């Protein structure tokens, strides 16, 4: 897994094993963000429901948003997202199946709305800790309108 801000927000790829959740336990993860679809999960742990008790056995205090690889979040979708991202600032993990695509959109995302940054400074500040963030055409076109539209978003996440 990575920092992409040291302690309060980073990424990882779907775990094998109980001992690399842990190992997220001693990096200062508390809070995981899950993103693959149930299929996705599956393939490792069998059950999704499982996955996820696994989780919360562990002190991880789960969200699972299944987002299609190489696609985004929708509307709906992100602002659930980023209310759950904004809601505790320390220990988050947001993760995918390989820690890059899916996973380095939200990450993006999140430093857009919460510095300002334009897009292609936040698609580099996550690319500089998890090359190759950010996959497709599709999710590059979401940040920039995440970007375009940062202060409807923030109404919209503190209503």
């Keep these: 897994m990575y920092w992409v801000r040291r302690k309060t927000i ?18 200062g993860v508390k809070r995981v963000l899950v993103l693959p679809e149930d299929w996705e999960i599956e393939e490792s742990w069998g059950d999704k429901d499982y996955y996820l008790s696994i989780l919360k056995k562990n002190g991880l205090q789960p969200l699972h948003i299944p987002i299609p690889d190489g696609g985004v979040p929708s509307d709906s979708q992100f602002l659930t997202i980023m209310k759950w991202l ?6 988050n993990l947001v993760h995918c199946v390989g820690g890059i695509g899916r996973t380095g959109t939200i990450l993006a995302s999140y430093l857009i709305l919460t510095e300002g940054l334009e897009v292609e400074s936040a698609i580099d500040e996550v690319r500089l800790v998890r090359p190759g963030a950010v996959q497709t055409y599709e999710q590059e076109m979401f940040l920039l309108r995440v970007e375009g539209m940062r202060k409807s978003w923030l109404k919209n996440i503190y209503s």
């Design 10 to 27: 980073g990424g990882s790829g779907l775990p094998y094993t109980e001992n690399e959740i842990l190992e997220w336990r001693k990096e």
């Design 86 to 91: 904004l809601s505790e600032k320390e220990g």
